[PDB]
Ligand binder design. Structure first.
Ligand SMILES: C[C@@](CCN1Cc2cc(C#CC#CC3(CO)CC3)cn2C1=O)(C(=O)NO)S(C)(=O)=O
Ligand SMILES: [Zn+2]
Length: 297
């Protein structure tokens, strides 16, 4: 069978919040079968645990934020992307502060640290959410849709006019083991234009060339430029895999986003969950006939 996966060992990282600029200590821990990904604010007494699920999402403003009462876990999309990409069902994510560390802006450091520690297949069937009908949402021109597909595939189009794009489209099939190579190292990005305002609403406070692609009027500012020519839209795919993992299981279907962000991504999951004829939960008692395959543990 395609088995549930956790971490083989505990992982410790130290970084900064992209939006808060706060020093945070990250501890990823093994978790039992059917735990899912649970975030934990360990700086609070008592410890406050928020499962990484669609229902727990609060604001979706320049990131995906989980909320329980007045308590928040901000910027979960890149770490969840990494977990989703490597096929991690069950893990406790402890944070010493409200926001996940930004690292280099990518999921690369997360996939590196996780695979350094390694994965543990568990004695239980991995559950997948199979898309059964098309499910679309639209906020005027912006647009997000799930369509049935035999495997996992994510398509996305940046529509907006800026000199730096030399149109950014991409469409990637993650039915096999493509995630690390294709999208993992795609960094987040922001415009010099927006920084003054974002800092005024307590955002991008930890933002710099170290953890992001910074885009002036005409040029990328980063000394060493891009990792891929389509890095911008590859990151929109990275974000999408993160947000989509808030379903709490791996997807068997296709996602297409036209200028869709965290807001629409979450609207999509909320509608999908509501429409129980548009999806079902499946396991695979034989991995050889499954539409998805994963890296050796
Ligand atoms: C939400 C989104 C973008 C997130 N970011 C990344 C990001 C970097 C940035 C900056 C700066 C800077 C500066 C200087 C000041 O020190 C050095 C000049 C601001 N910003 C921002 O809002 C994302 O990746 N979410 O996961 S996205 C791709 O749009 O969906
Ligand atoms: Zn992002």
């Amino acid at each position: 069978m395609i088995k549930q996966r956790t971490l083989k060992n505990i992982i410790r990282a130290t970084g900064v919040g992209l939006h808060s600029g706060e020093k945070v200590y990250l501890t990823l821990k093994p978790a039992p079968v059917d735990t899912g990904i649970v975030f934990s604010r360990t700086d609070l007494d008592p410890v406050v645990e928020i499962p990484a699920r669609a229902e727990n999402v609060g604001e979706t403003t320049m990131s995906t934020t989980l909320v329980k009462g007045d308590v928040k876990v901000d910027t979960v999309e890149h770490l969840l992307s990494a977990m989703a990409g490597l096929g991690i069902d069950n893990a406790y994510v402890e944070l010493s502060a409200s926001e996940v560390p930004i690292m280099d802006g990518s999921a690369g450091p997360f996939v590196f640290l996780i695979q350094s520690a390694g994965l543990q297949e568990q004695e239980a069937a991995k559950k997948f959410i199979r898309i059964k009908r098309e499910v679309s949402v639209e906020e005027g021109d912006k647009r997000a849709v799930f369509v049935p597909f035999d495997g996992f595939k994510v398509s996305f189009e940046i529509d907006f006019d800026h000199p730096v794009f030399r149109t950014q489209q991409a469409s990637v099939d993650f039915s096999s083991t493509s995630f690390v190579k294709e999208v993992s190292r795609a960094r987040t990005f922001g415009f010099m234009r927006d920084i003054e305002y974002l800092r005024s609403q307590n955002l991008a406070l930890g933002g710099s060339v170290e953890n992001a692609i910074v885009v002036d009027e005409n040029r990328v500012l980063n000394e060493d430029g891009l990792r891929y020519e389509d890095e911008f839209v590859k990151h929109k795919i990275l974000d999408a895999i993160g947000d989509l993992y808030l379903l709490g299981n791996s997807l068997i279907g296709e996602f297409r986003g036209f200028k869709s962000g965290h807001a629409l991504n979450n609207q999509l999951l909320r509608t999908l969950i509501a429409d129980k004829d548009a999806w079902e939960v499946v396991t695979f008692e034989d991995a050889r006939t499954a539409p998805i395959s994963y890296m050796r543990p």
